[PDB]
Design a protein around this ligand. Structure first.
Ligand SMILES: Cc1nc(C)c(-c2cc(C(C)(C)c3ccccc3)n[nH]2)s1
Ligand code: NA
Ligand code: NA
Length: 215
């Protein structure tokens, strides 16, 4: 049976160029804006993500909620040799799509895909995936999970001073609990990056929260 996610992957494989991550991004953004709507960060927000990666040049990045691999491709393509992306995806079919997307783009050796729930996998990073601390975390999974997974990252000792959290959809549909906590806590230095959801004709935004150390 055909699914939307399989259709996205097929469109990329037909029209993008293997080993060319930029063509893969353009293909997905074309597909989602012109052929069939899908959950997608999109190019406007993508350029903010690009800027953050280039500013902090993280060596170890954790992504929560890979879906079809658009953001994994977006970030992994800007990573240096020896840098790693760890990405978590709760849905097995989407995890498979993400793998094929990264393989097509030529980035499969920079990325480890973890199939499971954030709250189960996050406490295993130190022991099983040889993580000390994370340089960057991109949050784009279930919205009611942003605040508790941030708290769990902190108590698992995965954040250090200077670790960048970047969270999507904090306005639409909105994560006001997360926002209240990080903006109000002295442990996080926060900035907001507005971006228009053109298809929905409403403004959304990404929050950047830089860990400052425990309170
Ligand atoms: C507690 C959770 N841990 C993770 C890693 C979660 C996750 C969410 C997601 C998307 C693609 C956004 C998703 C998945 C299923 C339904 C709706 C939406 N992928 N991974 S959820
Ligand atoms: Na999103
Ligand atoms: Na703060």
């Amino acid at each position: 049976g055909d699914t939307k996610e399989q259709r996205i992957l097929r469109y990329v494989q037909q029209n993008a160029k293997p080993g060319d991550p930029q063509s893969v991004l353009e293909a997905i953004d074309t597909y989602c804006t012109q052929k069939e709507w899908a959950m997608n960060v999109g190019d406007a927000k993508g350029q903010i993500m690009d800027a953050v990666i280039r500013e902090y040049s993280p060596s170890l990045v954790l992504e929560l909620g890979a879906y079809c691999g658009y953001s994994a491709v977006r970030m992994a393509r800007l990573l240096q040799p020896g840098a790693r992306l760890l990405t978590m995806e709760i849905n097995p079919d989407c995890a498979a799509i993400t793998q094929q997307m990264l393989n097509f783009a030529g980035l499969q050796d920079k990325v480890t895909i973890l199939n499971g729930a954030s709250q189960d996998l996050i406490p295993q990073l130190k022991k099983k995936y040889d993580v000390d601390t994370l340089d960057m975390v991109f949050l784009d999974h279930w919205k009611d999970r942003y605040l508790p997974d941030t708290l769990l990252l902190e108590e698992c000792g995965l954040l250090r001073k200077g670790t960048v959290l970047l969270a999507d959809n904090v306005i639409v549909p909105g994560t006001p609990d997360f926002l209240a906590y990080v903006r109000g806590s002295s442990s996080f230095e926060c900035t907001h990056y507005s971006s228009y959801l053109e298809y929905m004709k409403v403004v959304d935004g990404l929050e950047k929260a830089i860990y400052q150390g425990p309170s």
